[model samples]
Target: RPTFYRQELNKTIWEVPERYQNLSPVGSGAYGSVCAAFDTKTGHRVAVKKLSRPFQSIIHAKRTYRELRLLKHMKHENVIGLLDVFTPARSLEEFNDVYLVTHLMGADLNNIVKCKLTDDHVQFLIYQILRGLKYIHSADIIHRDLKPSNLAVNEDCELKILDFGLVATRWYRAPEIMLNWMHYNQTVDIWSVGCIMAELLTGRTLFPGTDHIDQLKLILRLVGTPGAELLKKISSESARNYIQSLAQMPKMNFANVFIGANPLAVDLLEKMLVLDSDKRITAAQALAHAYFAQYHDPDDEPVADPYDQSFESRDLLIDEWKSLTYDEVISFVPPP
Candidate 1:
């Protein structure tokens, strides 16, 4: 067992092992605060995320458990891996905080966007994302959240998907989600990938909606009005009625919107951004699309055995969550 050390980072207390040193605040959000630190034992930098009030509510606790469980089982070059997990608490009664350590990339895609990106850069980056998604989807897991900030990148243009807590940013969210669809699958993630690809090409958000209604309008403007058949798929009466009230719109030409983007790239975007999730391009199919022909390697695009998501189905109290999370942390043995 490693000795527990405590320090305050970004005004939040972090109690982790001594091997991680020189901690500096990186970013903080609804989920938790993150810091960059050097792991003396491993001789590499790592990001330590201190999950904020993980046991405060079932929602937060479940998210923490889900992220930890998913990351621990996932092994992909473009998906963030769980390096270590720890809590200062020795027993369930004292358990409160959960710290997750992952690779420290130079910056996320959001930061990288400030710099100019060539068509080649855009293609390669999107390719890696799809490759990662293929593996994640193979396990029947929906990233649920896919955005520039959620994608981490280094100087070499290596990108890795992180922050699996899930939203689905409104601008990048699928139309089905916005329309109040009762059930969604990996296609929702494909919609986000399309939005992200468009942003990379234009350096602007594809659907910068001010509210839920505005979001659907923005998507409809580009993809055109959803057909009556599509509208009927929405279970939300208000949502379906709202769309019925709007005048039918024609789909905007991608060539006109993207101006000079490669036709193949634009073609892929159209397939991915389809209003009907059933018609949306899948990650596996997207990997084989001509846009990635040069980089796509079927042999290298590995898929995972279906992941067991039964744990998420359980409804547990805060105490149960704490005990489960604590046991998860102690179960990890650092790689030699």
Candidate 2:
């Protein structure tokens, strides 16, 4: 992972086709601004990402460099691909934000679940999302901001993880980090998984809190407050004090929360939102949950991993996440 960029930055985005006029801006992502474009060269379509101010700035040229570095090593079909990065050599007038070249994955996961999603689609989306998360966690990378909008898909029902920019946001921010950032583990990603899963079922964010306190309150409702016994496991004083002072939060039982919710998901959701970061289910462990067992095979018939042990549900899904890269993933998604 080279965090620094010594390569020359092209002043303007190059290789623009005559028919490829930039259309109205589609969406804004963590790393840069995104807009839809027409590709005259191949008579196809694509999205161009304009790096946000200071992102491609002379001071932090490494931001794009870091993204390129990580994308090079990280592999997954369900992740956004970094197609190309460039700058115009014409002038340094606005070198702050450079244009980014990428594939246009469909609307995010939140929109998918909230809008036109079928039961089978939800199942497959959840499976693909977790598969992508497992890959990032194994690499020691944490997508602190995991939400429905961060999950994108195409017409084929293929899901791709989006926006690795916000390492923390909304309900996806792990309480453990506030409790103690020093000792946190890969459970943060699992927390996002739980939130997204809940959203898929409820058609909204599981813990849609307004602020930090509200976030804790929302979480307290889903997982229940940790008693003195569970609270003792945390290492930070502020975290301990907050739990002690706000110990009376109401307990919401996830098991019976939704009558028609996936029956196999109740217990797993309960455990994933646990207040104690240490006790929260690890990403590797979540791959084994019964919720996934129904669709994911640890064996020959599994979703993506052909070599997984099809006999067991969680046999080795977590261990076999070395399959696709960001760029390879982009290749699968054409400009639609």
Candidate 3:
């Protein structure tokens, strides 16, 4: 076990009880700051993340604790790894900065977008993304935010999902979040995935709204008005009934958008961007998609079965799987 100590200031920082040289910062933006440092003892490099205040808090847990607690358990190679955690240092020597250290990683998806990727490459990217999400979903952790920025690089350029619940508004937001409904769950990630896949092909924001209301309009333009069944999922009969009041709403046809914009990428996007959450292809189902299957090169041998990743071979560049208790990532998780 690691010994724990707190600084006198309001901030909290705990040392991992292990020390190494070459500790440094590599990335920082949302919900925390990140530094990459060399572990002199292990002769390896690792990233140390200091928590950032959140735009919104989920419940009682601090942002650092929440991420640490989640990452501590959900260890996936494609997902960022949590090597260790410590309270922030108080003074300059012990400055208060809650730190989470993991192996250093590659450039984020923002950088990936800048690259010129072939259609086949985009498909491969999406396949790997779904595989990562499947891991997170099974663990019952909702990444909440799924924009390109949150996609970080691990050892082999495999995406390690970071910033968890802190995903910005640029990507996915269900009809519920659009209308001030806060009750949604992991499906948010799927919605964002669709938006990203579209942007990947077009190099644009799938839903580029100027403001929240404008965002709502943009979503409506693409996804159409949520009908009675969609409204019924919510508890507010007023809002559900208010649907009739909005004469301005139009119907959405996602299929046409994809088929028109990128002939090569529609089938998978349709499954992900589908308006109905239930009808929406699940992370697991998406992996099984024929569209994704087509992207597999005949020469590229299958790595491991998507569902059974618990054990693996060392020859593959796959990032280590994010750690998770079977109970957390399984159907066994409470309401999952």
Candidate 4:
């Protein structure tokens, strides 16, 4: 049996492994609460996330399992690395909560966006994002959610993408997704990168819509309306009709929208924010763009094997998910 230590914070009990100490709340959300702690064995600060009521529903359990599995498989400098996973339960029936350990960063991009950044800072930050995406895409995974809050940054400008949860936010969501397309691909992530890049340059959300429909209107206003051929790709007939019914709008000039930004940066944004997923710039292609020429290194950028999705394809009950999660928690071997 593994030794466990219990602590109380914000009136919630945290029963974690003995290796972690000085547990203090960092952030809290619907899924769980995060605590900043020091790992005595590793001698470094770590963020411990306590997943609340993982088995509350079939959907919740599935999300918890997927995030855990993906984190276990990821190992990239620009992606958040999972250091350890644990649970206080000694058996499958007793399992109810799960805890994940990862590296601690100073702040997420949401906090950094408030300040003005230099052109070099924007270039390096965007380079790291694309670098991480290249690896994730190689594994055949679409980080459906890529927003300012999901990107963590340090004092030295080091950035890492975290929170591999489901669902993309409306403002950064790809037009295809907003249109209810039957099938979307990695290009959706590139669209989000475009939104982030625009925010970094302008210091405001590019498409701050009140609702999904409003979001589409905001998107169309900037990129202009998609042609008939591109609209045919959308699975939803009503959605297609809605776009066709709108008055044709001409695409806005990037120089005018980005005002005073480098011409190369404006050029890259144009490529990334295309209405057609098929025409959107890919992570690899974006990394090679002239805007990032100073930092792009094809030799240094690495790709990963496609992730196995057999388990994800299966339909499992809550009990099965609980058993699988329990097995994963006990599989970890602490430092010797």
Candidate 5:
């Protein structure tokens, strides 16, 4: 336990009321600091993300709004839910920072992936991820980023996708994102699923790269170059020409890479890692794959569209968008 600071109590800085007595700094990222704390109102443990400066820039404002909208209405067992939200400022003028509260997860998949996991555990985890992705895609939302660090898991086999922000590393980023394509759909996320699945199977990153060019090289080296059709859609002429000029790379053997890997799992991996976004396997399709036959449940399938037209874009003023973030907080009443 960390020492409680009495002097900090006087300041009104996104602190949940009732002292929030037991708190321990857990982690900090580009957005803000996350702390594990005890909630007084509900007498439960919670994870609180104190935004560094939510309204600091237009990008931050948009990200805050997008993340809030998705978390608010996108209800799914595998998706992270917003437990509560607050700001110390009573008036809009005084509001500069924001805090988001959610269930306190034990650990992220990044740490857990390092440990030896049974095939059943791996299969279950992958199924949940695909199920969650299906729901997200059906809602017309693309989780631009999907990686081990963004997944939270408990001691049991439960998993939840967190951090809906759209910035995955180059290593895990899909071909569409790497190409900087003018238009991209949910298929972009499927590519990331392949990368993550490969990482889990081999206990090493499937595509490790130091930069954007290197990332493409790493992917092409293993997965081979995109077909002629996909290469034509490349937004960058230089990239397309360079890829065309390179010696044709042969596809790597998935089975050899993942020793004792299931044939069904390998088949799914091949479908997902396809360079052409148009040819990529969808989350729904992936869920139906034979690889997840044991875990698939049609009756209890996750709802595809929890928020139908609930968060469509409107050309609202910046102030309106900013207030929506707070409005959602006040409006949401968690179930007892």
Candidate 6:
């Protein structure tokens, strides 16, 4: 098996084992520090991740567990695979460091957001994203974080979802999330997917919210405000009232938003962008939609099938999460 070793970066000795040679650091941000390395054992390049203070806060700890457990349980061509996991600490009492190894990707979708995209390219990317979502939502798990940067892609039009830190960026976030709706479901991902599709066609973020309030304003400007019926579902009174108090804003024409988008594609996009989470089209339905008639493979079994309630989020203690992660790392297997 490939191994890793730690190296000092700006004085901090970021560690791994030695088998991953020529380790080059990638982006280090809110999620964690990542490094690209060559795998001697597997003879393939891989991405190594080091979560930043995963147990620093309850939120971080919970998200760490969620991402680890969910990734361990679910598998699909469009979802990033976990190659291996390890912690250098010899004992639990000294444990704080954890590392993840995954297949190296060419680049994240963020790098290609401004690239010229033909209709075929658009179709392929969106199709793969929905395909990945189908697998994730099938387990009744919402990705929570969906954005261009979080989506990895290669020259072959292959796309894989990553970074399940449980917090989507403000611009692409669904209204339900911004409003803190406790009953949100997998449909939140559909909304983010719709935003990504629009960005691919327009070369600009569909909703560029500067902050939470600005995000709602931008969304309403294009998507329009929901009626009282949908607003009633809002869990927060202040947020519900805030939406109700706003002057009526009609949805901009889809034609206006996507200048030359395929009518069928726009139809699917509209369904995905629906303001009401309960009414948002599901990943499974999107995969089966007519927009992908030519690309849809009937022989391919649906990924998001019968709902699996077992994947629901939990509030486990830090030690419990650590123990489970340790088991997964020791028993690493090819995900489904």
Q: How does each model score on TM-score?
A: 0.94, 0.73, 0.71, 0.95, 0.88, 0.88
| Top-scoring candidate (TM-score) | 4
Worst 10 residues of 2 by lDDT: 316-325
**Candidate 6 per-residue lDDT over residues 1-336, each given as its tens digit:** 444465786534676777778778876876778888887878989998888887777677766766776666656779887887777876667778778888898888776545557777888899988888887777666788799988998777788898554623787888888877677888999999999888887777888877888888888988888887786666688887788899899988887678788888889988998998888998888988998876778567355445433524566777776765566566767533
Per-residue lDDT of candidate 5, residues 93-198 (tens digit): 7776677788788877777545556677779989999888888788777778788888888888688988665323777888667756658888888998888887
Better candidate by lDDT, 2 or 5:
5
1-336 in candidate 2: lDDT tens per residue? 112222212432333324445454675545566667665555546777655543323234434444544554444677776555444423333233345555677666655434545556666777777777776765556677777777777878788887564222666767665444576677777787777777677776666777777877777766667787776666677777777787576667666785576666777777787776677887556667777766665452223222222222222221122111122223433232
**Alpha carbon deviation, residue 304, candidate 2 (Å):** 14
Off by over 4 Å in 6: 1-6, 56-62, 90-94, 304-320, 334-336
TM-score quality measure for candidate 6: 0.88
Task: Kindly list the per-residue Cα lDDT of model 1 for residues 225-298, writing each as its tens digit.
Answer: 98977876777888767888999999889878888899889899989988888889999999999999899988
Ranking by TM-score: 4, 1, 5, 6, 2, 3
lDDT of 3 by residue, 149-193 (tens): 778765454666765642256446665566666667778788888
Error of 3 at 324 (Å): 18
Off by over 4 Å in 4: 333-336
TM-score (C-alpha, index-matched) for candidate 3: 0.71
Report the lDDT of model 2 for residue 251.
66
Q: Note the residue pairs that clash in candidate 1.
A: none
Name every residue pair that clashes in candidate 4: none
**lDDT of prediction 1:** 0.84
lDDT of 3 at 95: 34
TM-score of 5: 0.88
Reference-based lDDT, residue 317, model 2: 28
Instruction: Sort every candidate by lDDT, greatest first.
Output: 4, 1, 6, 5, 3, 2
Residue 158 alpha-carbon offset, candidate 1, angstroms = 0.7
Model 4 scores a TM of 0.95
**Residues forming the 10-long window of minimal summed lDDT in candidate 4:** 327-336
**Clash pairs detected, candidate 5:** none
